[PDB]
């Protein structure tokens, strides 16, 4: 069970790594689809000021 | 596997207690057995010192 438990705790270690570098894609995809918004709304607000 | 192993080991405890129960149980009674026969060798040697 000791030992078990060693490869329970490697497991999860590199899920501990992975996690961390998973909020860093989902916080880098964040703050990219978050540009989306402000170039496509430059892009809407240009062309308003044609009726 | 190691829900295996918990319930063995616990299963196991379970089964073991009944031994080491039975056993210390099973040595009460067989004192209190001997105790009665250390009372009777001494009758046999009160006995035999009677006779002699």
Do not use: P, Y
Request: negative net charge; glycine residues 4%; aromatic residues 0%.
């Amino acid at each position: 069970q000791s030992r078990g438990i060693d490869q329970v705790g490697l497991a999860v270690a590199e899920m501990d790594r992975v996690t961390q570098q998973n909020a860093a894609l989902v916080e880098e995809s964040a703050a990219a689809a978050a540009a989306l918004e402000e170039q496509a709304s430059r892009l809407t607000e240009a062309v308003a000021v044609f009726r | 596997q190691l829900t295996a192993t918990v319930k063995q080991n616990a299963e196991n405890a379970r089964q073991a207690s009944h031994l080491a129960l039975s056993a210390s149980e099973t040595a009460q009674r067989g004192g209190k057995v001997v105790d009665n026969v250390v009372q009777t060798m001494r009758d046999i040697s009160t006995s035999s010192q009677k006779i002699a």
